[PDB]
């Protein structure tokens, strides 16, 4: 008898340049041995599956989905171990991988973790309904599997303007 539990979190912010919604999705699966995290930033509204406005973003515009050490992405409860590397890739509308980027190194900053700059997405993809996706695992060693995740998106120049604020924290207790 294998058992697992999955939560999907979604939220929304504002791209300052194009004045459009920008969205994130975070899927977290707990199978008893580890938490698997999948984090996607996209212009496709997860509620409707409709792509945002309006064709008028240039192809070489580009965004990151992780801050560097401008901000902590992830904090972990007492019975979660060290996160793996963070795989980075572009996903299509159905979440299947289109191409892959360098795997990032998860490091500690502050009370939690970040990974640093690695992948980006450019209008040439955002406009196809694609997302910029990162995934990693964290071992479970006991009962306190709480965590918080803070989403991030910014154009590759000007790393300081997080499109999500970033006051849109995901907080899971235990």
Author numbering: 204 to 377
Authors' account:
The pneumococcal serine-rich repeat protein (PsrP) is an important lung-specific virulence factor that is present in 60% of strains capable of causing pneumonia in children. Pneumococcal PsrP promotes both biofilm formation through self-oligomerization and adherence to keratin 10 (KRT10)-expressing lung epithelial cells. In this study, the crystal structure of the KRT10-binding region of PsrP (BR187–385) was determined, revealing a novel fold distantly related to CnaA subdomains. While one face of the compressed, two-sided barrel of BR187–385 is created by an extended β-sheet that presents a highly basic binding groove, extensive well-ordered loop regions distort the other face of the barrel, forming a paperclip-like substructure.
